[PDB]
Amino acid sequence: LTCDFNDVYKLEFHPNQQTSVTKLCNLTPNVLEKVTIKCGSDKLNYNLYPPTCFEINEVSFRIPPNMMPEKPIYCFCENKKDIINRGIVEIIIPSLNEKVKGCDFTTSESTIFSKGYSINEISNQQDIVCTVKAHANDLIGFKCPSNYSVEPHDCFVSAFNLSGKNENLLKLTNIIMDHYNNTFYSRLPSLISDNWKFFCVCSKDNEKKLVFTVEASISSA
């Protein structure tokens, strides 16, 4: 899931080229996978258009979880001299077949998550507890209001035990902890060998706590 126009799909001119050379780098990421595009550096004078692709010289992004099918996104790494060698990145946008298992504490009409809560629900002392039952390969996540803090701060790297304490987690994968929008994601392993329950908490002084609890059950995928 890298398009390296610097050393892999090389855009170096050849001697006495009459016409362009065009290279195609086609990617089929899964949702939330990281794509990297390398285009240009100190020595290699290449530009990427548009400068950030999916809204040395290097860009990475991850495709968000979406239920709206989209046409591929293209971006162009250009080498000039008028002859232009161009690397064309095509990213097929994966679409989800159902909402992400988990909890959007910021809307009752989430674009992303299976369960949502309106501002009236999360407002005013009992916890709001949102429980998801997850199995092998499930994508899970939650979003808390931007004003809230999340405990533990690195939820999914660590989480709290329904029984014991903070536990460095279960081989969770593609962990995303986006503190800009207080949105957290990860993927259960393809093999879960033991039942595990854990939780993370969002809070804000004088507000109901928002509890995201996961019951991960023995399974195989």
- Collapsing DSSP to helix, strand or coil, 194 comes out as coil
- Strand ranges (E), the chain: 2-4, 22-27, 34-38, 47-49, 58-62, 73-79, 85-91, 100-104, 113-116, 128-134, 139-143, 149-151, 158-161, 166-168, 173-178, 183-187, 191-192, 196-203, 210-216, 219-220
CA dihedral 37, 41, 45, 46 (to 10 degrees): 10
The total number of structural domains in the chain stands at 2
CA dist 49 and 74 (Å) reads 9
Neighbours of 206 (CB within 10 A): 7
Together in a domain, 14 and 29: yes
CA distances to 19, 22, 36, 52 from 88, in Å: 16, 7, 14, 14
Together in a domain, 88 and 194: no
Rg (C-alpha) for the chain, rounded Å, is 22
Together in a domain, 42 and 123: no
Solving technique = X-ray
Neighbours of 159 (CB within 10 A): 26
**CB-based contacts of 144, cutoff 8 Å, min separation 6:** 105, 106, 150, 182, 202, 210
Together in a domain, 114 and 199: yes
**CB-based contacts of 119, cutoff 8 Å, min separation 6:** none
Q: What angle do CA 97, 103, 106 make, to 5 degrees?
A: 110
Task: Give the pair of three-digit tokens for residue 146.
Answer: 């931007």
Together in a domain, 107 and 216: yes
Provide the residue range defining the domain that includes 55.
1-99
CA dist 71 and 51 (Å) reads 20
CATH number for 127: 2.60.40.2860
Task: Give the pair of three-digit tokens for residue 64.
Answer: 């968000």
Q: Convert 63-117 into a string of H (helix), E (strand) and C (coil).
A: CCCCCCCCCCEEEEEEECCCCCEEEEEEECCCCCCCCEEEEECCCCCCCCEEEEC
| Residue type at position 19 | T
Last residue of a domain, one of 65, 99, 133: 99
Determine the longest span between alpha carbons in the chain, in angstroms. 76
Q: What angle do CA 53, 57, 61 make, to 5 degrees?
A: 40
Together in a domain, 117 and 144: yes
**CB-based contacts of 167, cutoff 8 Å, min separation 6:** 158, 159, 160, 161, 198
